[PDB]
Amino acid sequence: DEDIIAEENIVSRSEFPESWLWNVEDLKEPPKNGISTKLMNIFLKDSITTWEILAVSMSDKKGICVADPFEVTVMQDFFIDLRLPYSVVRNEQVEIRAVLYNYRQNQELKVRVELLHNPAFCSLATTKRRHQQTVTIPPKSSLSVPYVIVPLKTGLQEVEVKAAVYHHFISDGVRKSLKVVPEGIRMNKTVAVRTLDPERLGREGVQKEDIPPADLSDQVPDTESETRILLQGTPVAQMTEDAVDAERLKHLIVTPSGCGEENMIGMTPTVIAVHYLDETEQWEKFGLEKRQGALELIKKGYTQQLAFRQPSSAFAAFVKRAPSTWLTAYVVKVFSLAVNLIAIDSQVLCGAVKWLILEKQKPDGVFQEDAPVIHQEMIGGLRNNNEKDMALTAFVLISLQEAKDICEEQVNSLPGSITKAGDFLEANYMNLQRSYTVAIAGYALAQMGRLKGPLLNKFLTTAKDKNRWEDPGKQLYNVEATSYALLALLQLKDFDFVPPVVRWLNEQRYYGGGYGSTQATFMVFQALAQYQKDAPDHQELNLDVSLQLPSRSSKITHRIHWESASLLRSEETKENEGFTVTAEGKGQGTLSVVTMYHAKAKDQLTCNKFDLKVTIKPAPKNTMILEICTRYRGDQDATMSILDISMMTGFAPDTDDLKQLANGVDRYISKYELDKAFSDRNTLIIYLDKVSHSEDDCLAFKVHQYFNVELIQPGAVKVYAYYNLEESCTRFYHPEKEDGKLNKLCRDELCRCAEENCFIQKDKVTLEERLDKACEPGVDYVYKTRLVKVQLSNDFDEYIMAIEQTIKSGSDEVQVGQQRTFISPIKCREALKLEEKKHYLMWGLSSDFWGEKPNLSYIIGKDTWVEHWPEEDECQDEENQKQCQDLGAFTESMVVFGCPN
């Protein structure tokens, strides 16, 4: 118009992020008083609101620090708020609101607001027609502007309105996007759940697993679908143990005193007490402070055992007594186990080992006792004079083998002695009668790996009930022999036979300490401590999963290991692929493939909670009656509900009819909305104290047209209870159009807007004006047709034209005589006024095809030429002639030549 800024000059606001300035800056600016100052230039976005600016600092000196928020308020004197919804359903007609705020102190504004045409949307604005309202906005107030549209293609489509004021240089534009979604219900399907375990059924040829795609046959076209692969790991282990409670061992901490032998009887329970407690880690339960004091007693025992070391590196009860074979073989045993606890001298430990070998070993390997220990109760089951040629050579052997690592480079005759004493035991193992001898010599041979064959069978079948190595005598010789046995089981790694043997020891409830409890106490706890070390605990999750998806070119290799805080791995693909998985290794896993997609729906309507009927009738300028009828779909009468109304562009409700509703009980209308006027009451809200659930609650008021304009925008009414926005219902109203729904032809889920000219035009229509318009690059088809049948409906008419000649054949392979359905909106039944058995000259574009070949249908659009062809005996009439001569000449100029270009 005049004295206003045109539409193309206006740059729309487009940048509306919800958060921005996600920056990382360093305060390196020269500091003044330890204070750095950074200056940043920023382009504030297009939002009219208030921004919150939050800064966090990190300094290796001052640590972390969250700063107080800094708010920036962005505003403008005149603007539009285009309030879209999050999403809209494809083909669903909905109303959108556009609010124009005028915040100028005392300056009213004559404004123009225009919705811009977008092919993805079916609204009033088209290519060649604008949709512009002229409206006035009072000082310090807002104005709601309703637009109805229809999204025709899914995805991130875009609505955009502009507005300008007259006589001033003030303009604004808002370009916002909204996600358009198809029609369906969220469905989640399980594709494959297999147990990944090579070895178990998954053959030694490591498991291969074929995984099919998902059905997704009812997947609504034009929707993404994600496949999520998952690697669940089943761990469950348990090589379990129940160690002896430490509170039961308080007596095993004994102060070592006395002579060469008595000192050893007291250092025994203490060393074997610390050892067991260090391995079972009960030190908290026992009392953590008591360990340090137990270290002094073990160091005190060892120190006092140096004064009884004879020059020959051997030990005896006294210093004047002849050295004992067994005692020196026990000193080695104890000191060999207390190496990590106290400082065991290598000269002392290995010296006694060297002495045993060179002095107290017979050629055949046997060790001979020459000075029996005075305390004949500390030795255990050796006291029994039966087979002491084996028992001693088995005892001295174990002591030598536990000093191995410590005395290999210091004693070179050790390797020769170990094998020698093993040769004698091995040969005479099959001739043993006592269970005690079978155990202690069985542990001495198992340490070399020399307990196999018939010997191994003898050791195992020596157990009574497969849980104890007992001899008809004292029980502490039996606790000892089961303890050497449990040690041998652990050495050979026979973990199938062990649990029963250990359960027997635990049920004995032996806690060491007593008369001659030296061996029993050192051995029963040496065995139950090595029981906690020869674990394992699981076994191991060592899977190697490979995923080959025909989509990706690179293989996906996952390694699920135990002792890793995860055991879960996932991969996502946007394409429904038929892939294969190959596992490898130990462990029992899981493989779950879950796809996600949109399935086809069978519809509700919906509203679910509200019924709605809206009627628009003429009154008994224009003035009409708007009747509204609503009802709640529950069991109770709904509470305060809202009736949100928009007007038929250029219509204002009747004030006097409103006052009458306001005074009605259970109904409310703000003073605000009352005293608006013709001015601009295009929107109205009637608050309802309630709506009934049994029958309809109906109201009705008169609407007056204050500004008459061609092509009016359908009104819209929307109900909803105050507490819930989603559960709403919205009906439309237009004098003509069915129920506010704009014209659109649909098949399945594809739709195209139909709000346009019914045909091209109508000032003299000559032959030249026909050859020019029928040979434009676009024009595809040209037929002389005859109207056989006309089918009336509620939305689209169907004119079954039988083609009588194909002047210019197109993409449609139509022979002469066949019939083709021409579709036209109901609003075009009067302007076309096509009659049966008559002829017409028609031509249109290729975009005016409907359906799939060979079953195509034609659309009588704004590029379709509809012209009445007079009959044979009608050309005789001296007024149709001028036309007849033109059509008959348009016939032979298209048949012979065709198009100039």
Partner: protein, 630 residues
Amino acid sequence: SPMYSIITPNILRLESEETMVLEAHDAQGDVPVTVTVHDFPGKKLVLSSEKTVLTPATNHMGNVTFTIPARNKFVTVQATFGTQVVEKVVLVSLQSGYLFIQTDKTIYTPGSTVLYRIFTVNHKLLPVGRTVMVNIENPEGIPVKQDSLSSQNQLGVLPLSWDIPELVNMGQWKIRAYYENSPQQVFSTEFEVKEYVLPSFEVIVEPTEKFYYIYNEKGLEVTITARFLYGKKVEGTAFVIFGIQDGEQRISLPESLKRIPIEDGSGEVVLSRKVLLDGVRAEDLVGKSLYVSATVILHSGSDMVQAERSGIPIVTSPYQIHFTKTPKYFKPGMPFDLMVFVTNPDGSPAYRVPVAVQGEDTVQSLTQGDGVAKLSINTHPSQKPLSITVRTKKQELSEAEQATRTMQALPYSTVGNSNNYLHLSVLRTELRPGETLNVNFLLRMDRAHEAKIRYYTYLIMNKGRLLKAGRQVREPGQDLVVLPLSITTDFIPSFRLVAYYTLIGASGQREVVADSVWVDVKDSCVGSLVVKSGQSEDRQPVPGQQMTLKIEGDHGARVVLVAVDKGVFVLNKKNKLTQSKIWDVVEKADIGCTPGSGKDYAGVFSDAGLTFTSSSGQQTAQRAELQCPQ
């Protein structure tokens, strides 16, 4: 009889410089000190380093700063003084420190990108470099994305993003993250994923009182405020309803449903006592709470916003009294100081509220800015359980409306009933960094041995470390000596002062007497970070305008910004990052578990978070628990 002592923290930590206090009492000449840390039990030598010499010129107070590389685990701290060795087993925390997570928004729409930063800092809050595992769990608790990043050379700031797919479960999503070295200790932030659009105004509902008094005839008066994000006041209509909660269950009061006109950005709506009591005896409602649900609709119907205040407590008394700040042990016959903490029913501190003990009788005291009141009561030299009850003497109110609370303080048990006490008193005021504190050392013991107490040893605890140790000189006859203790940004937010003296007395018996105290310091940032306008003038900016953003901070630091549309916080304001939420975490992770003092000397120490072991056998209790008692 020289006595060598050692003090360290209850719980030692990995990859951190834990300090260790070395001492020699009644010592002569120099004394060579070697410190060792071994894994427990056995020998693996975790820290051999740290050897020092205690000098007469230091009164024989030394210090070794050591680091530990890197069921529960334990170390054996070992301390050899010349030939004499002292060792103590101490507990070790696996916790490497803290992780803080920050997302851009509070809520997100399927199809958008979640921007999130991980803040990796030790216990002392300084940035550290570690490997970090990061998970993202859905509502039902299923991880869909995991990263394995490292804050090495990264100045403690690990940026990250995640594109929410359009196909995703709505509701509460969670980001969980932990240190590779400590999978047990986990750090989480929730973010909502929902289908939403940003509204153009906000709605604030504020009840006149932050609580409800069952006998207030007037009822619950609520002010429904509504203004546009850009400032202007809203014109519209509001629906408001009320409800009763107890405790996770809500009951809606249908007959309280009102419709109120929102004019000039405001509206008034009241829940009359009548309606309340009808919707359910009145005293049965005490303990429960009230919530207000607002729904404001612009007279245009083009925009609609819902808001809600919840947890308005129903109470007989407008106050609560707490002794969480007063120590539970006194010194028989010595003045006892009380830290009464008076809150408003919601949990906020109540300013200027006079309090008093039972009777009283002039003896009063007003609550300050932090909601704390300073009472001091004179005591009997009896070993009887001191029982103290407190009010609460606000006029305008009534005895019936006044609040009350009752604690019980036990006597400090003395070494073989020697009647030798120590008491640390501090003048109560909001301590700011930069100020100097006047710590008061009052000594109680018979004059027969008083001349032997020549110095007190004090130790400052903070964030769970030994911030500073020192010696307070004393001459014979001085019952009360003062320590001018400077307060720095390092004492934030709270600190413990523990001090003690040792001597030979009774019958040649070694005696240790200690006392602790907990002082709150003005919570803030250790340094400073200010964000403001660079342009020194003008009104509001216009959409698409360039503006200068001034940032004032500490030299060397790295700053990470973000700008969110305050519209978002109309939808969800929860799970934001605050400096206050940081100091909240730090505090809850103190090894010190008590306002001060202790049943004995071994109690003062362990309760405060320290270990005292001597060459006379005077040691603390072995702490087996990482958590505080309860």
